[PDB]
Design a protein around this ligand. Structure first.
Ligand SMILES: O=C(Nc1ccc2[nH]nc(-c3ccncc3)c2c1)[C@@H]1CCN(CC(=O)N2CCN(c3ccc(-c4ncccn4)cc3)CC2)C1
Length: 345
């Protein structure tokens, strides 16, 4: 009647509830499959995580689980179930069960032209989800096409909160060329200059990059290394203004920028000659050099480009902000145990 199913060598140890597994994808995180859920009689996504190796994997696993279990929003992927062993001793893998989707925006953009109506709907759903995330004082910190799931009718859900943080604007300042973890092409210029990425404006940048990418099917700032990223950004925005430069108090960052030859702004309408002019106005406001002047998520939702969809009464916010590293291996494993206990018999 049963006996562990397997996919591409991996044990997939999720029965008897979930059967008829089929491979979907793989990555550093581990392996995602589709599976038939014998209780809800629908196929689901299931990902196998095996993080008890180093405490960075456990950290990303804890953020993912705590954040997704607390959030409840149409444009954010949920967690439906979590499978692990009944004891901490016996627990080696964690399986996380989620709604099955058709594709993601990365896969779709590599193959498919988006109509302006698709671009607009996708952007609306991205911002609607992000409004909820930011309302909970959380930053996603790794928005990119691969982290946007789409079902067969183009409903969009933000996924992967493994790099999320609680916002902390008072502690955002740092030095020049301070190392960073989130995905290079979607990093706002201030990351390379003086920002730890602890402000909501980090995410708006990333969304801006996504919007550009939906317009041309090409990443807008495809830098090949840390500082190369800034140089792509400045190649298009042009040299920052005196005022914007004056806002960078850190001398190493400020003097770097002063060292560069003047560069002119590339007009959006020349980069995206097929784009809706309202789209390019919002793009401009999202890809603003100076993070203080960068448009916020609720202003973005109110922008004329999104007028067909905007309805703040149907753009919900979180009930309460989050306020949940210095924690040993053993304690991180215990917390993953405790957090997943609600799904055990
Ligand atoms: O949520 C995720 N995937 C996902 C979910 C639901 C879905 N429904 N439908 C789909 C779908 C259907 C068809 N085509 C494409 C997609 C789908 C995909 C991804 C997989 C992983 N997840 C992040 C996550 O689970 N985190 C916790 C674990 N973290 C982690 C843990 C261990 C390692 C690691 N690395 C190296 C060695 C060992 N462990 C790395 C990251 C990363 C964040 C984002």
């Amino acid at each position: 009647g049963a006996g562990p199913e397997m996919v591409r060598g991996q044990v997939f140890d999720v029965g008897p509830r979930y059967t008829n597994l089929s491979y979907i994808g793989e990555g550093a995180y581990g392996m995602v499959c589709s599976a038939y859920d014998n209780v809800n009689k629908v196929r689901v996504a299931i990902k196998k995580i095996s993080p008890f190796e180093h405490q960075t994997y456990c950290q990303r696993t804890l953020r993912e689980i705590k954040i997704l279990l607390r959030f409840r929003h149409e444009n954010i992927i949920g967690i439906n179930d979590i499978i692990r062993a009944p004891t901490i001793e016996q627990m080696k893998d964690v399986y996380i069960v989620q709604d099955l989707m058709e594709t993601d925006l990365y896969k779709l953009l590599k193959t498919q032209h988006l109509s302006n109506d698709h671009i607009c709907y996708f952007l609306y759903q991205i911002l609607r989800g992000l409004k909820y995330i930011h309302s909970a004082n959380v930053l996603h910190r790794d928005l990119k096409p691969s982290n946007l799931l789409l079902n067969t009718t183009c409903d969009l859900k933000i996924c992967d909160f493994g790099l999320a943080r609680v916002a902390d604007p008072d502690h955002d300042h740092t030095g020049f060329l301070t190392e960073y973890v989130a995905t290079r092409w979607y990093r706002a210029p201030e990351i390379m200059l003086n920002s730890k990425g602890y402000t909501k404006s980090i995410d708006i940048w990333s969304v801006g990059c996504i919007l550009a990418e939906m317009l041309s099917n090409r990443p807008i700032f495809p830098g090949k290394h840390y500082l190369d990223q800034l140089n792509h950004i400045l190649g298009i925005l042009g040299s920052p203004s005196q005022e914007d430069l004056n806002c960078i108090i850190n001398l190493k960052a400020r003097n770097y920028l002063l060292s560069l030859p003047h560069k002119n702004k590339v007009p959006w309408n020349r980069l995206f000659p097929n784009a809706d002019s309202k789209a390019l106005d919002l793009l401009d406001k999202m890809l603003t050099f100076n993070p203080h002047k960068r448009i916020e998520v609720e202003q973005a939702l109110a922008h004329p480009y999104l007028e067909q969809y905007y309805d703040p009464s149907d753009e919900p916010i979180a009930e309460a902000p989050f306020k949940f590293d210095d924690l040993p291996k053993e304690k991180l494993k215990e917390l993953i145990f405790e957090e997943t206990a609600r799904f055990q018999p």
